Amino acid sequence: MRTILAGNGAFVLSDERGDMPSHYDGFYFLDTRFVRKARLEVSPEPDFIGASSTFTRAVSHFSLGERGILVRLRTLDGVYEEKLSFYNTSEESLGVKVRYSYEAPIEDIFQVRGFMGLKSGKAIAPAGGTHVKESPSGRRSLSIETNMEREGSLLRAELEIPPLGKAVLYVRFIPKIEGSISEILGEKRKTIKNVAFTGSPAIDGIFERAVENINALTLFTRFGPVPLAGIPYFACPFGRDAIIASLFLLPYYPEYAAGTLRLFGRLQGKRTNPKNEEEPGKIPHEFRLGELAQSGKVPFAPYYGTVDATPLYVALAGEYLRWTGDRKLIEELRPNLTAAVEWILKKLDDGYITYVPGILGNKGWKDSRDGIIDEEGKIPKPPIALVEVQGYTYWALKLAGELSLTDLDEKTLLAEAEKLKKRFNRDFWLGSYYALALDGEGRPLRVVSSNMGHLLLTGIAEHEEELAERLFRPDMFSRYGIRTLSAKEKAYNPFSYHRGSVWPHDNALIALGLARIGRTDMAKALMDAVFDAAKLLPERELPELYSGLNELVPVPRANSPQAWSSASVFAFVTASLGMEAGDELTVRPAEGTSIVLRGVSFGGRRYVVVVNGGVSVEPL
Amino acid sequence: MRTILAGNGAFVLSDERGDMPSHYDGFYFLDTRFVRKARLEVSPEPDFIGASSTFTRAVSHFSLGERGILVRLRTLDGVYEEKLSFYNTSEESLGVKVRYSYEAPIEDIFQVRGFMGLKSGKAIAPAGGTHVKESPSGRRSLSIETNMEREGSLLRAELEIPPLGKAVLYVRFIPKIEGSISEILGEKRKTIKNVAFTGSPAIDGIFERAVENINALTLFTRFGPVPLAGIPYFACPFGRDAIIASLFLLPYYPEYAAGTLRLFGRLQGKRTNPKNEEEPGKIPHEFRLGELAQSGKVPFAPYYGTVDATPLYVALAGEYLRWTGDRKLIEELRPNLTAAVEWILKKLDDGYITYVPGILGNKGWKDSRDGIIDEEGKIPKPPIALVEVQGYTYWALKLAGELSLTDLDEKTLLAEAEKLKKRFNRDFWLGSYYALALDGEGRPLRVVSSNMGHLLLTGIAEHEEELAERLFRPDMFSRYGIRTLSAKEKAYNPFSYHRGSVWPHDNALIALGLARIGRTDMAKALMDAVFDAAKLLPERELPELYSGLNELVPVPRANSPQAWSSASVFAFVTASLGMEAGDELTVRPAEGTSIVLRGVSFGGRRYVVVVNGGVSVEPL
Known about the structure:
The structure is a homodimer. Chain A is of the alpha+beta class. Chain A has helices at about 110-115, 200-215, 240-250, 255-265, 290-295, 310-325, 325-330, 335-345, 385-400, 410-430, 465-470, 505-515, 520-535, 565-575; strands spanning about 5, 10-15, 25-30, 30-45, 45-55, 55-65, 70-75, 80-90, 95-105, 130-135, 140-145, 150, 155-160, 165-175, 195, 220, 225, 385, 435-440, 475-480, 480, 580, 585, 595-600, 605-610, 615-620. The first copy, chain A, folds into two domains: about 5-175, Distorted Sandwich (Beta-galactosidase, Chain A, domain 5); about 195-370 and about 375-620, Glycosyltransferase (Alpha/alpha barrel), CATH 1.50.10.10. The first copy, chain A, contains 14 helices and 26 strands. It is classed as hydrolase. The entry lists the keywords Amylo-alpha-1, 6-glucosidase, hydrolase.
């Protein structure tokens, strides 16, 4: 299986023996792979027996005949390090001769993935054990400290171990990067601790893995700690991923919203520019820190190929203040915040907020090229106005006015919100369901989708209840969550990126909104379904997505860990209990929920919430 | 890694892909391997991605190009079964052609291990899908139900899967055995549930794994449920393993002592016989149920090559009654019980209870050939009187009299006990420590050992405290438990079976006896050390033994799961809290212990024990 180490923006993927075979294995940091297919060869060449793994440390155990034992021990705290300790087990002297193989393409993460058909990077072969690759963004250096006689890019050693003696041989790939990029990093580094404790071992293993998932995907910035998106392909700050998951972790770890707001406060668009899809006020999609993005070789620093991350950014702030009370931050950000809502409203000059296919096929959360379809599975005429992002916008503006989060007109903002509310329902409602989107000349796309489940939490829907019961019909309810599309549609395939596959965060958003409308029982069935899913997956880890068949079957493209999905675990509990932030912290739970939460954060103080046939809310 | 399925005396070992490569892999039931090196070959031959595992079910997930996905799913409830479900992922038809390889040596478990240099068994090639191997103990049959065109001992299939379709192909190795052997089995089959809950995820994962370890190693007999010993080499009832671990699980799951007492009540020796080391009253070492043991081809059914299992059997009963009150059972067994103590006392005709090397090099718990050594590491002259088994005997007789468990003389038994108590201390105490053993003409063996830690619980020691502090010296205290020998001795090697390696049960026994003598703090350091060990091993599983170096390093011969060691987790908590059974259930804990126990069994009623800066004992 994948065994992964990961922290502070660095990660490693490996075989269990800590090998870097299969394509997607290597040592990465700030979206630049530094090493890949490393290999250890020492003879007598060992015979593996067992392994154990955290996220900053993994060990595999090796038999070496009968007179020997190897213990491999790999670590990651900025530096990657391998330690090979050789144990002599019988009372005869033992000989070993080692030689370790590694290859150091200081290549950018797009070069990895076959993005743009991009080249792999060449092994750069070290100059006094120090490889450097230059780019105008900055110098990109890999340093190697080792106790092996090193011959270019292959390390060597031999020595004989006395009987019952042992021998240890290190290697450390020290990566260090300067330029446009450590203007971002904060030296803060401390790790969160789980706060959900339900007293069932199967379940608590979800939350605790949720929390070690979140730590391995945290990058510590100047502005605060911010969530990285995903570990195979998305190891950098996305905006939709980092905002959504902050909202999930808003009632427990607010510090993660306050970094995302502060970071994308400064990376807001200040100009119009068709290279990077920038616009004045817009909030980016992704912001890689590779040599490619910072020297303008690809427009992703920041790329602005999403239009949901902009109303999301402001809703989250409206929510953050609803939980924290940290009004200091919001007028540190209200210049940022008004420039956001004047991007919203003048993109409502047109009537809906819409996007046009660009580098990515769409610019919602279903950002793949076949994600948005019609009634018979063809991609509809652009510009596309997506149902979910018209809900984030009503939700955006109604709170920017209800809480005075901007400096523009007040009930002006709410006037245009009720404009759009009645303009939305009217234009999207198809008697049975809301429509996935309107196309470039206005006709609706009559396909039922989980995107409409995103509007229970916006309150733009006036037919709230019947959106619900349609979402739970057998065409939308798999045994483990709400499928991204329905199985009755022509273009349904359960193993697709955005056309039938289940997604823990997508379901969780729908669950948070079933809590706004007083359907805590249906939110609970939605938590159950994906926990029944997390009960049967490796390490009870929630990956990006998995199949929609009624038998649990993963999706190979699925990325694991992944931030919005390992954080959905907590959103699921905020809706499980119907938990709201108001003048006070209320809990009106669904029936048969049982949970203790030692650290709910509301108004800067922390409360003990207990639900065990009765509900109690008291400070820490 | 080893992935293991196991239940009701059956078990499987495998690669993760459910393969049976490496020597020790196969489908076993009642000490007769039935299948080994099974192999699945289907093309397009798959590319593994991830796996998940219980103990009655394991699944591995496979990529099949990009248009395919395989899900392997193996199960064990008496029958072994493999299910291969093939998923077509892209909208083109998909072709697969399968052919599955298995080989069916209905061989006995000794044939497996190179015991006696024994042959491997021949593939027996099926007669209408049904292999039979005959032996006078009984007919030994393997039946195969399958939906593959089967060609001898190789199953075949091909069919093409429509787009987004799937295909499933079964195979079931039905093993069924008749003869001298299902006179033992009970049809009772229900599984225990963990009862320790300490509110730390690292720790609770020990107890819960402890409990699933115990279930996979339970065989359900006519007399009750009884513990099997160990999964690589010991998959059958041992007496020392099954009694000790019953004592550990005495305050939580007494039903496991009551089966061991009832089973070895009937397998008691009724005669003298040098083939099987039988003697009138003696209690066996092991009792395999293979064709070999039941037709007398090897003397192990029952073999009586241990002399500790006989005083142990009666102490445990004296303890069982101290906890249960189930006096019904004990005079169902008091004919058994007097015949036990008349074996003790007439083996004390000689002065100590002693054994002579036979098939096994020793007949204590250190039953290997180099386990018992002298001051310079040579095997001492026999007969050997071991320090630990002279303690089990004082403990045996003092309680057979304190509770009238036999029909012989009362304070007669206690007279000979205080005879032996003063005869023991005198003859074993060497100023600094107790001696490992006396040899055939009486001289002590001056090597410090963990065997002397076994006597704090017997109360034969009169120098109780200084046995303690010596046991915790740097020569005996590794970072993860009390080493079986000391590192200062000439013949210390940390990776030996019985000469320096750490053993969870050996340490646990020592901990239970530090609780008899009011040293709850030292018992806690002894629980800590091996939990710090269980925190860093795969699945936080406690194996039979591991290295004594101060860095954690396993021992390849170590067997995992193993009953006395995965049950030691509970013994460690009985001593953690200083928990005793008397007229009432008292708890005087060590400092800084924190635990809830929802189901302590005492006197047939169950109590809620809570230790959280204060102690409470109340019924369920």
